[PDB]
Amino acid sequence: EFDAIKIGLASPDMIRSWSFGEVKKPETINYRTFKPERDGLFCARIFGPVKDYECLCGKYKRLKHRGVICEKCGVEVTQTKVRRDRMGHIELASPVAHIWFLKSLPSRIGLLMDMPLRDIERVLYFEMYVVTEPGMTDLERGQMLTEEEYLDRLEEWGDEFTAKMGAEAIKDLLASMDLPAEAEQMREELDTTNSETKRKKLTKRLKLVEAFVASGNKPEWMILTVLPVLPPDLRPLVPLDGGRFATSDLNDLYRRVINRNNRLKRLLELAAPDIIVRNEKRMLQESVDALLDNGRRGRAITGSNKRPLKSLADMIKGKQGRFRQNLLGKRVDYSGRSVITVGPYLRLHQCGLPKKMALELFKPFIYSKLETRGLATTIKAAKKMVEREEAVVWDILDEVIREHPVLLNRAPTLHRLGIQAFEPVLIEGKAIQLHPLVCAAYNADFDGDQMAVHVPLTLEAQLEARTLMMSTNNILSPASGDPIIVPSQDVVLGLYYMTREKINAKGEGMYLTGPAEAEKAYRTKTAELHARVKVRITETIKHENGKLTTETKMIDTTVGRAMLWQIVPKGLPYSLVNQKLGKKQISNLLNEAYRKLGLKDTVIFADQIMYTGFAYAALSGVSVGIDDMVVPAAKYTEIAEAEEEVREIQEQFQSGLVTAGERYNKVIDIWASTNDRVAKAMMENLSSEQVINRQGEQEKQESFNSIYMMADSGARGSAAQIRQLAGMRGLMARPDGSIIETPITANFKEGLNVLQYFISTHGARKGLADTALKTANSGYLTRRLVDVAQDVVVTEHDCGTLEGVVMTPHIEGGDVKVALTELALGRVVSEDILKPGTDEVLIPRNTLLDEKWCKVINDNSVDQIKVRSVVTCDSDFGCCAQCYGRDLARGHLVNQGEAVGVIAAQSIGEPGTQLTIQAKNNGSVKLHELTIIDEFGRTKEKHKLPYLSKADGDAVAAGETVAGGLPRVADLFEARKPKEPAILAEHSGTVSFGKETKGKRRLIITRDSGDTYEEMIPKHRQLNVFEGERIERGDVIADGPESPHDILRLRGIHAVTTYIANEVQEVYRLQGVKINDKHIETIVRQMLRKCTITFAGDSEFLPGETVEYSQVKIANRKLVEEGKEPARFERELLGITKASLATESFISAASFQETTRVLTEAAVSGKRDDLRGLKENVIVGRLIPAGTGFAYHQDRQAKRAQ
Amino acid sequence: PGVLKIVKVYLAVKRRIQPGDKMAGRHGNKGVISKINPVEDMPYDENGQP
Amino acid sequence: RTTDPVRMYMREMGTVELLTREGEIDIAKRIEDGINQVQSAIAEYPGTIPYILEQFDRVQAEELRLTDLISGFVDPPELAREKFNELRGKFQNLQLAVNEFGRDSHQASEASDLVLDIFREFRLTPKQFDHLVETLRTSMDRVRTQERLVMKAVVKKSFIALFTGNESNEEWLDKVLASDKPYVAKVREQEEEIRRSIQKLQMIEQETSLSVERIKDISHRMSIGEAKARRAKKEMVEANLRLVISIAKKYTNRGLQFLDLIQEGNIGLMKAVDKFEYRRGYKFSTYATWWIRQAITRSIADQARTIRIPVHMIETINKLNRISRQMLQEMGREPLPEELAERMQMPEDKIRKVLKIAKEPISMETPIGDDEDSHLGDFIEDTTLELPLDSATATSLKAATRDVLAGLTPREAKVLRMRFGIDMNTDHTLEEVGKQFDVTRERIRQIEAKALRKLRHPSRSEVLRSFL
Ligand SMILES: [Mg+2]
Ligand SMILES: [Zn+2]
Ligand SMILES: [Zn+2]
Secondary structure: OOOOEEOOOOOHHHHHHHEEEEOOOOOOEOOOOOOEOOOOOOOHHHHOOOOOOOOOOOOOOOHHHOOOEOOOOOOEOOOHHHHHOOEEEEEEEEEEEOOHHHHOOOOOOOOOOOOOHHHHHHHHOOOOEEEEEOOOOOOOOOOEEOHHHHHHHHHHOOOOOEEEOOHHHHHHHHHHOOHHHHHHHHHHHHHHOOOHHHHHHHHHHHHHHHHHHHHOOOHHHHEEEEEEEOOHHHOOOEEOOOOOEEEOHHHHHHHHHHHHHHHHHHHHHHOOOHHHHHHHHHHHHHHHHHHHOOOOOOOOOEOOOOOEOOOHHHHHOOOOOHHHHHHOOOOOOOEEEEEEEEOOOOOOOEEEEEHHHHHHHOHHHHHHHHHHOOOOOOHHHHHHHHHHOOHHHHHHHHHHHHHOOEEEEOOOOOOHHHEEEEEEEEEOOOOEEEOHHHHHHHOOOOOOOEEEEEOOOOHHHHHHHHHOOEOOOOOEOOOOOOEOOOOOOHHHHHHHHHOOOOOOOOOOOOEEOOHHHHHHHHHOOOOOOOOEEEEEEEEEEEOOOOOEEEEEEEEEEEHHHHHHOOOOOOEOOHHHOOOOOOHHHHHHHHHHHHHHHOOHHHHHHHHHHHHHHHHHHHHHOOOOOOOOOOOOOHHHHHHHHHHHHHHHHHOOOOOOOOOHHHHHHHHHHHHHHHHHHHHHHHHHHHOEEEEEOOOOOEEEEEOOOHHHHHHHHOOOOOHHHHHHHHOOOEOOEOOOOOEOOOOEOOOOOOOOOHHHHHHHHHHHHHHHHHHHHHHHHHHHHHHHHHHHHOOOEEEEOOOOOOOOEEEOOEEOOOOEEEOHHHHHOOOOEOOOEEOOOOOOEEEOOOOOOOHHHHHHHHHOOOOOEEEOOOOOOOOOOOEEHHHHOEOOOOOOEOOOOOEHHHHHHHHHHHHHHOOOOOOOOOEEEEEOOEEEEOOOOOEEEEEOOOOOOOOOOOOEOOOOOOOOHHHHHHHHHOOOOOOOOOOEOOOOEEEEEOOOOOOOEEEEEEEOOOOEEEEEEOOOOOEOOOOOOEEOOOOEOEOOOOOHHHHHHHOOHHHHHHHHHHHHHHHHHHOOOOOOHHHHHHHHHHHOOEEEEEEOOOOOOOOOOEEEHHHHHHHHHHHHHHOOOOOEEEEEOOOOOHHHHOOOOHHHHHHHOOHHHHHHHHHHHOOEEOOOOHHHHHHHOOOOOOHHHHHHHHHHHHHHHO | OOOOOOOOOOOOOOOOOOOOOEEEOOOOOEEEOOOOOOHHHOOOOOOOOO | OOOOHHHHHHHHHHOOOOOOHHHHHHHHHHHHHHHHHHHHHHHOOOOHHHHHHHHHHHHHOOOOOHHHHEEEOOOOOOOHHHHHHHHHHHHHHHHHHOOOOOOOOHHHHHHHHHHHHHHHOOEEOHHHHHHHHHHHHHHHHHHHHHHHHHHHHHOOHHHHHOOOOOOOOHHHHHHHHHOOOOOHHHHHHHHHHHHOOOOOHHHOHHHHOOHHHHHHHHHHHHHHHHHHHHHHHHHHHHHHHHHHHHHHHHHOOOOOOHHHHHHHHHHHHHHHHHOOOHHHOOOHHHHHHHHHHHHHHHHHHHHOOOOOOOHHHHHHHHHHHHHHHHHHHHHOOOOOOOHHHHOOOOOHHHHHHHHOOOOOOEEOOOEOOOOOOOEHHHHOOOOOOOOHHHHHHHHHHHHHHHHHHOOOOHHHHHHHHHHHOOOOOOOOOHHHHHHHOOOOHHHHHHHHHHHHHHHOOHHHOHHHHOOO
């Protein structure tokens, strides 16, 4: 129907064209008949009939008289809905300036005729005069003339000059302007001037003027003469209950405007004194400003409820505005909500739906089937049977539900696994039964959480739910690729208890033919579940090439592992089960099952793991008791010794040997070592036991305590919680952050006294308050990230570029933090990977790194590899498949046309709630910086080189010495300059000293061309350079934190990309969160969209402005093919907030935030939004250019190419 | 004003405990009932008390 | 320095000082003699006295209201007849001495002055006064248009030389014909426009044939009088703006803002200045107070409610509230609609009707709960909407009716469809169905009867039964 949305200024002719009539009087409805009166705010002639196909006077009161206007009443007989589309207008007695065009800084009326806003507003509130037509006088345009000064001017000239006052004066000043010649005045003035402030103001005003000339808008339209009036149902006046009425504040604002305009017309008729007319015009301006944007021009007008009125702007903007409350998030039909319980009998693709919800949601489908099988003759009969809850309705429901997926959602939806499609199984009760294995994806636990239920209707929606949104297809985390269906809690406890080893158990040493024999033995109460036996295991290995090699050997194991081998699918080793299985071991089982078997085997295996774990956790009888917390006998002795030593240091403070701070920092260490020793003693006592073997000897065994098993299995619990259970609670922090000297020496088993409980509450309250504020901040950060990265879609398969990013293992000292295999898993190479010390092409170009090539790259020991990145992608819009690489949630290469930016934003923002020279390796050493390389090509250690046991190439053996996370992530993503930026060397050259002028220090750099560039340096800076030394570009001048801007300016794109990537990944990795670097790279690519032109070249760009980088690529490519000289640019780094408000489309920018200035700029410049993004297509209600809707848009583009 | 008659009806409903209802102790141990188990299926002691 | 219009209006009001009472009387006499000047000016026009005295002729026969026509008499039909007949007599002297004794004769001027002096002792209705002013205003207008047209045609010094006496004479055109300047060709081409110029105004200028020289100077006295009077009333209104503010003081928080009350008080003040008489010996303050309070109260009644209530019902509501207040004070409880009826001597049913008048509507933005995110506007349902079930039922009913009508004879189906308007753009009586076929009233009536008996049979009605 439509392809774009234009925005511009509304001329009075256009406003009159929109309107169906003129509103003249402020009356709304009659107080007796409750009927619209004539020419009022609800007039039936202007806006349309109140009742469908009727009229006010009742003369034409049926459909036969459509399109016929009554002579008695003037109302066109049509539907009532036309009242939500018909507009009106008010002919203002005097022109009124637009409030947005005047106080949306910068003012576009002040900056179009070169006059300050104080002067302009002095003219609008009718305080001074301004000359329009100087004529043949000494005055010029825009001169202030005070009232008395204007009397003198009238005395000595009189009729020669016109010096008007008010909005009319602004209107005819803008009338007298000639934009072409005035822009040429800019053009000739810019070259002559030298000051930077004047030049910047001049180019701002030139940009505005050129926008006016290009858009076709006239400055005359800047000031309103005809005021449009909104349709009445958009500002309804309706009877709530029993004669009480509900209205909208727009009615009050329009009533004020109409009343004051009528008063102005009456005053003009009566030839009133000038003061009264002037005051009336002032109130007309105030009322129109309050109608358009209340609370901006002055004090907000308040209603009878002592609350400010809501204007047009206040309801097109804000969180509670139209955009974010009704156009991006909508209440929907065919929806339900209920408490969630646990269904341990369900499968991954099944969810338990109550029959009441199924009956209410699937009602039209039930009607359809009842009519098609003829049980109900018509819809009324079908409704009667459905309401009566007849027997056959349930069979019809179980036939409609049979293969119809349903979408389950939980609030908040932090990532895309928060909405999933399931096949419904109909159940009694009122609670939704959820499969346990998906709870971790929902962050859902059954203490009262509720979930929402959505029924897709069209065939395309059902196919999308079954193919993309099924829980079976969603088993890998899109953030990292790790499985998300890993078992937890009861399953892990059961599998751990089943896979444990007990010494001298019943049936030890028996020989078993296989897993079935072991099951038979345990069911017959012959061999205990933890009895060591020898079992004949048949085992199939599925090699990387597809070889299926079967083998059969006798393995020493337990009965439990033999049974668990029954559910393990063929193709996996027995070494994956022949060990005690904690959370990590089961996660590895699922990971390897997915890697070597696929998805179907993995989902069946996950289900069977869940059932086996539940069954054996039930049969185990794990119970927590009061004798399970074994408090060590060494705790009391350690407390006594700590008290004695604290008293010793207490009688040593009076000796003056120590200070108060030293006493504090020594008592803290005394107690913080007593705590560690008590914890270690408790762990040693709790994790071991002494048993009697078959021979009769006393042998040490790992303990079977309930709390120890809970902690060691990884089900739920950790060492710190045990230490607070049976050891010492420890030192605590005061509400200011200080640590109380006397710790809590009692645990929860023996209880605390009053003071200890008070101190504990001091920290509990902080934890809760910080959780709440953390949730708020993480939500805001995720929203900003989505709004910056919403336009990144994989649009091509290959951009045909040669650039890439190098990657090496991450080293932060003498140990590896993360290997190259983890970094490069799933990234397409950029250049051929040569064998170390050889010209052999081990890995060719344009290959995707799976686990097979990861094993290859680990075995052949290569350190640095070049791979493609999203930041280096050359795609004009979005990215290409090869530069992104592997889709983490699918395991294969990224498909064409999926939103990778939204995935990146969700992956980065989801873990926000969780966010708070000795030599050891043999090898050689080298200088780069300092590196220590092992025997192979891997560089094991990396250390900085300050301004020396061994020289370069000297072999070194072991032991030979040479000698607020979330605020940080937000700070990095908004590119905030640090408090004390570290100065960098702008140009390569020799340092030379200048003159220490008053205030601060100066330096100079001498370039290779003889240029002397002056550098401003604060006095407190600890300079790290010496005169006579040639420093390189980007070298550190003063030590300190580095802003991303100067890294981008003086080092490059790759440098800033790496800087942001690892300085966000350090925050994530410190907390234990795994996020792939492609997401941060995508955000960085969106953060580097802008460039400033420096050389005009043969392009039309004027140097000194910001433009999008893709536009410059297109222009430069065209100019190169034409042969004319290209354009030269500088690439700029913008924060995730500025970049979003600087998008080409104004609808997305308006929907994000800062609506007033976005709309003002768009209207003044006359922009066109081509609807080429996710958010604009969501707002307008058409298919998004991503996923299933990608190809469709492509065809439209093809239809727009021809 | 405007109303001629008001009739007020009190309805008493006996709500039984069912899956989905929230049950709790006095130590922060909340929960949602997942199943109403038959008596013969639940654990019992030596004297036979389930 | 300030952004509040109220304080700015206060500043511009404070610049005008409060003049003394002697100054107030001086302004009053300034308006009085300005009115006398404009009154005597419009007298010097040969149609004013006829119109005044044909109005007198109409009112003497009591065809028009006597009180409305005459505002009063100044003392420097008991007495009005005397003055009207005296004006009759000096008009008889005048329109006889106007031409018989010559226009330029000093006796004619003296008789005109006598008539002026006699009429001066009259104060008349403002409506007819305005009529008299604009009657001469239109004449001035078209003669100005003629001279501006001849200016546009010719573009001078010679015209100004004969602008004293020959600006409206044939002699000017004759002498223009006598000119032989190099540009007499262009004014010759403009002579055709002149022939469309000086004929146009020459049917009105002879209506007041003396005033040809004198239209311009009578308009000169017109401008003098109007400017003088408007200056005087401007000064008085600007002086008493402070009284306007003091009066508007006690009407705040009544649904209308302060500045609107001030402006309505300004309207009242201008009305009071228009009809103020200092010869009462009475201060302005009281008369101004009455008029300003009237304007403020009327505007509050007319513009302080979303659903407008007329002034009289507003007074009824105010009296309702006041008497409820008195009865609550007297008897300690809130008055009931029974007891409140007898003290106001107005029926109980109308007391209730006034009580059930809708109050000020509640905004759709009001916070429903303690939270600021829930508003009244989200809890209001669209009741005019049609349910999708009803639309499906309507479509099914149309289909079933079509299927049933398919089981009848073509003529019978046609008569049923035409007399109940199905699948057509209108409904029809049996006359139209009779005319469309070759068939009469009773025939069509009984074909419809036969159709309804056919469809009342149970065999072809089970489907339609489910639609009820
Ligand atoms: Mg919960
Ligand atoms: Zn009508
Ligand atoms: Zn690419």
